[PDB]
Each structure stands twice: as structure tokens, then as C-alpha cells.
């Protein structure tokens, strides 16, 4: 394990996990306001 640097409070995600965490983090802010647009859309 590791040793790498540096903990604690300092971490890093690698390849897959990030490319995912990034996409999830985007669909998050996205999917919230995905209802808004369009005349059929509502307010919040």
C-alpha cells in the first residue's frame, strides 16, 4: 500500500473511479434541472 503522498485529508482517485465520479458528479447537477426546460417544464 502506498506509500504515496499524502494523507490524511489528501487523497486521489485513479482512472476508472474518477472518470465515473466525474460523470456522476455531472449528471447530478444536470439531472436536477433536466425537468425545467421545455414549455412542459416546471419551476422549483
Amino acid at each position: 500500500s502506498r506509500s504515496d503522498t499524502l494523507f490524511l485529508g489528501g487523497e486521489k482517485i485513479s482512472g476508472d473511479d474518477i472518470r465515473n465520479q466525474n460523470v456522476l458528479a455531472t449528471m447530478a447537477v444536470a439531472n436536477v434541472v433536466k425537468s425545467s426546460l421545455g414549455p412542459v417544464g416546471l419551476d422549483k
Partner: protein, 533 residues
């Protein structure tokens, strides 16, 4: 984070650090046992977590009765016991050399001499040293059978501590004592044939040993022989209290009060066996006690009865007054006799005590050890024990050998000689050989220097130097005289030691350092929280 494991709560003292933790503690057990050697030495008071006090100079005593957490230490502590078991003395000698020798080891590493190369060294020196020890000889296997000097030699062995100063009376008391149970130790019959009773009185000087076992018993009834005159005895070990057949029997009286016949039956079934003993020939002795009734039968049939004779005693009772520890008297008396000596009973120090004034075939004996404090006697028993075991085994291996450092430097001289051929064969390993000597030399210095403070004779420098200059020549001669502070021949001086002893003092040591230098690392897995506290 790493883990890096290994495991938590575990630590790897590795390599040189291992070399440290290894060596760095072995000689730790030095400053602890340094005091013990040399008649001019002093003792140590040990306390514990149970609020108790021990003030004795024995090493197995100050090493077993210690708390230590460094392997090597505990390891040498372990080597301390090895001695105390197989021989009376030399436990202290085993450590001081063990350590000092190991001290000389962590030293060759200042020169960069591989440990395996020092095992190789010490190995040659070790055997090459014991060699010359063998060469000394001087055994009194043959007449003059008296070999009184050898007995004197054990006393020389026990010199120092507390007992040695008084005498010179102990060797005579031990010597004689062993001489009775001498033939006994050869047989594989332990030293337990000699019993030691603490009835403190007067001074450790007044203490003495009476011929004819003493016992703390009776005589548990007023209408009983206070003393038995010439009367014969019987050593027995049958059941007197349970009084039950060795069967699963459950008397069930289907009638009205048929027990009145059974409760009398067994109450008489003992009278039958009781009557064979009445049958011969007088006093009775038996391990298992004798209930109020049966014992009160003898009392009226003129037979002094002695109950609760500990296993040790019944065997001991067999040893003195030559008797057979036979229970069954349904055959009596084929190969079943019990000789005896007047058995007058005498109290000592306000304590009741029956001892036999007259007896035969004394292959065992009790020895009282009066004193001044319970603490004192506890330390006399050890001193008698140590010196009493020495003499014991010496009678099993007649090989004698001069004490006082003579034996040591004789080993040291003979060593350095081959050794100073040791470099040549082959070079570096030689220093290890040469070094080995330094140990056996050093123990002698510790003996006078750091331990033989007074009389004012203590110089590490001069004394040792005197022996080497004046010791190569005296081959097994020129010992030391830590009383006057001179180099005088022990042999004319009664400084005689056991071959078995001064042999093992090295065998052990040598064997110890070897496996220790083999240490590269050492690991542990914690068991108690912390506990740095």
C-alpha cells in the same frame, strides 16, 4: 498508513539493532550477579508484587526471581537454572562468564569480525579450554579414601554469602550428611533424603544436625509412650480413615435397623487389621492418618502410634532405621522388617519434636538450622542447598580441581597459547579464540575487583596480571587469595572445586553465546494494552 506488515503491536529489532538488543542486555544480567562471587562478595534483598522479602546471594535466586523482558537476558536467566538443577554451585559463574564472554563478542565487531567467524573462534577456544581442565585431574577416587580435603572443597565452594564466615562447621555437617546419603545419591535417590527443619533460635552458629531423623509428630494421645526404648518400628501406608473396601458397595438394610449390625461390622473390620499389627513383634508409623478410634487402640495395646508421616518422611523413615514401606499385613512378615533406635521426643524452640536417639542404617537425615530471622534461614537453606548439592555430585564424580581462579586462568593460559597459534590458523578467527580467554580471566577480576572489595585487596589490574605472569607456570596452581590480597597456591590452602562444576561453568557459557550470536533479528507480538506505563 503502511502496513507495511508485519503487524501492529509488533516490532522488528533487526540486524545491528538486533545485535544491540541482543548483546546490550546479556551483560545487563551482569551488574545483577556480579556481587555473588568472591568470599568478599555481598547479597541482595529481593521484593515482589506480593509484598515479600528475599535477601539471598544465590544467582538462580536473583535471576529466576527477577522480571526481565530482553530475550537474551531471560535466556541467560534460563542458563542460570540449568546449573542450579544439574549441580549445586556455578550458576553465578555461568552467567558472569556468559555475559562477559558475550561482552567480548560485541567488541570484535569494532574490528569487523563476522559473528559466524566468532562462533568458529569461541568454538575452538571453548573445547580447547575445557581440554586443559580435563588435563588437571587430581581425583581422589582411590585411597586415601578419606578425601577430607574434597569435603573441605565444598565448604570452599560455599564460602562467601552468609554461611561461609561462621565455618567450616557446615562442611563437616554437610560432608557427614552427604556421606550418609552419599551411596544414596549415586543410586538416583535424590537429596530429599536430607531434610532441613527451621526452628530458629540463637545464631546461625548454634544451628546443628542431630544423627537420627527428627520428626514433628506424636504421640497424639496422653496414654502413649512419650519415648520408645529400643522398641522396633513399622513403616506403613494403608488407609485408616476411609475404612472402606475398594468396591462399589452400598449396604442397604431392607429390614428395620439392620444397620445396627453393619455399623458395628465395619467398626470391627478395622479391629481385625488392627490386630495383625498388634501381632508384631514396639511402635507404628503410617502415612495416611489414624482416626480417633483405631489410633486409640494402639494407645491401650502399648504401641506408640505416629500418624500423618508425609510421603517424604515415610521414605526417609525407611532410610533411617531400615524399614520397609509395606501396607498389607495379611502376609507379614516376609521381607517386611523395621529396625529402630530409641525414640525420645524433645521440643526445640518452643516446638514439639520427636527424634530417635538410637538407630541403624542411616541413609538419610534431618538437620535443624536455627538462626536470627526467618529471612536468615531462608538464605541458609539455599547456601546449604547449593554447597550440599555440590558435595553430593562430587561424590558421583570424584574429579577434583583447584579453586580461586587457578582453574580459570589455567583454562585461560592454556587457551591463549593455542589461541596465539589461533591467528596463524587461520587469522581473524584467532582473535575470537584469544578473546575467549579474556572472559575466563575477567570473571576472576570481577571476583576480586568489582566483588572482592575488602579486606582492601581489590585491584582489577594487579591481581589478574599476577596470575598470568605467575600462573602459566603453576599449571592449575597459583589461584588467588582474596582475603590477604595475594597470589597463593590454593592446593596448600584448601581451595578445591568440583571438576563437574568448573567444567559446566564453561560448557553452559560456551553453548550460550554461540546460539546468541546466531541472532539476526527478534520479534514480539504485544499482549497487554500498552503497556508503557
Amino acid at each position: 498508513m503502511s502496513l507495511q506488515l508485519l503487524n501492529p503491536k509488533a516490532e522488528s529489532l533487526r540486524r545491528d539493532a538486533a545485535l544491540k538488543v541482543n548483546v546490550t542486555s546479556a551483560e545487563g544480567l551482569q551488574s545483577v550477579l556480579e556481587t555473588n562471587l568472591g568470599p568478599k562478595g555481598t547479597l541482595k534483598m529481593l521484593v515482589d508484587g506480593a509484598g515479600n522479602i528475599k535477601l539471598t546471594k544465590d544467582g538462580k535466586v536473583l535471576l529466576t526471581e527477577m522480571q526481565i523482558q530482553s530475550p537474551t537476558a531471560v535466556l541467560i536467566a534460563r542458563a542460570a537454572a540449568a546449573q542450579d538443577e544439574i549441580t549445586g554451585d556455578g550458576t553465578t559463574t555461568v552467567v558472569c562468564l556468559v555475559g562477559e564472554l558475550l561482552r567480548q563478542a560485541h567488541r570484535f565487531i569494532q574490528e569487523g569480525v563476522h559473528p559466524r567467524i566468532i562462533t568458529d573462534g569461541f568454538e575452538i577456544a571453548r573445547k580447547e579450554s575445557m581440554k586443559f581442565l580435563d588435563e588437571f585431574k587430581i581425583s581422589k577416587t582411590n585411597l586415601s579414601n578419606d578425601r577430607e580435603f574434597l569435603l573441605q572443597v565444598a565448604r570452599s565452594s560455599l564460602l562467601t554469602k552468609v554461611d561461609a564466615d561462621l565455618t567450616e562447621v557446615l562442611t563437616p555437617i554437610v560432608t557427614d550428611a552427604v556421606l550418609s546419603v552419599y551411596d544414596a545419591q549415586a543410586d538416583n535417590l535424590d537429596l530429599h533424603m536430607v531434610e532441613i527443619m527451621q526452628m530458629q533460635h540463637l545464631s546461625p552458629k548454634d544451628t546443628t544436625f542431630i544423627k537420627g531423623l527428627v520428626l514433628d509428630h506424636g504421640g497424639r494421645h496422653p496414654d502413649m509412650p512419650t519415648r520408645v526404648k529400643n522398641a522396633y518400628v513399622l513403616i506403613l501406608n494403608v488407609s485408616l480413615e476411609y475404612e472402606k473396601t475398594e468396591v462399589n458397595s452400598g449396604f442397604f438394610y431392607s429390614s428395620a435397623d439392620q444397620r445396627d449390625k453393619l455399623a458395628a461390622s465395619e467398626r470391627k473390620f478395622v479391629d481385625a487389621k488392627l490386630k495383625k499389627i498388634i501381632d508384631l513383634k514396639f511402635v507404628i508409623i503410617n502415612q495416611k492418618g489414624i482416626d480417633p478410634m483405631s489410633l486409640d487402640v494402639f494407645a491401650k495395646h502399648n504401641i506408640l502410634a505416629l500418624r500423618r508421616a508425609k510421603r517424604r518422611n515415610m521414605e526417609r523413615l525407611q532410610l533411617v532405621t531400615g524399614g520397609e514401606a509395606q501396607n498389607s499385613v495379611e502376609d507379614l512378615s516376609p521381607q517386611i522388617l523395621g529396625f529402630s533406635g530409641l525414640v525420645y521426643q524433645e521440643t526445640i524452640g518452643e516446638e514439639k519434636f520427636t527424634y530417635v536417639t538410637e538407630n541403624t542404617d542411616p541413609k538419610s537425615c534431618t538437620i535443624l538450622i536455627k538462626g536470627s530471622t526467618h529471612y536468615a534461614l531462608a538464605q541458609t537453606k539455599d547456601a546449604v542447598r547449593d554447597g550440599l548439592r555440590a558435595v553430593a555430585n562430587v561424590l558421583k564424580d570424584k574429579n577434583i580441581i583447584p579453586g580461586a581462579g587457578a582453574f580459570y586462568i589455567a583454562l585461560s593460559r592454556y587457551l591463549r597459547s593455542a589461541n596465539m597459534n589461533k591467528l596463524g590458523a587461520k587469522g581473524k578467527t584467532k582473535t575470537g579464540i584469544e578473546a575467549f580467554a579474556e572472559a575466563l580471566l575477567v570473571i576472576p577480576k570481577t571476583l576480586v575487583k568489582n566483588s572482592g572489595f575488602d579486606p582492601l585487596d581489590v585491584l582489577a589490574m594487579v591481581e589478574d596480571e599476577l596470575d598470568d605472569a605467575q600462573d602459566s607456570d603453576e599449571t592449575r596452581y597459583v589461584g588467588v587469595d582474596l582475603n590477604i590480597g595475594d597470589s597463593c597456591d590454593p592446593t596448600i590452602e584448601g581451595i578445591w572445586d568440583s571438576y563437574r562444576v568448573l567444567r559446566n561453568a564453561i560448557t553452559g557459557a560456551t553453548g550460550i553465546a554461540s546460539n546468541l550470536l546466531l541472532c539476526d533479528e527478534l520479534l514480539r507480538a504485544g499482549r497487554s494494552t500498552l503497556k508503557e506505563t
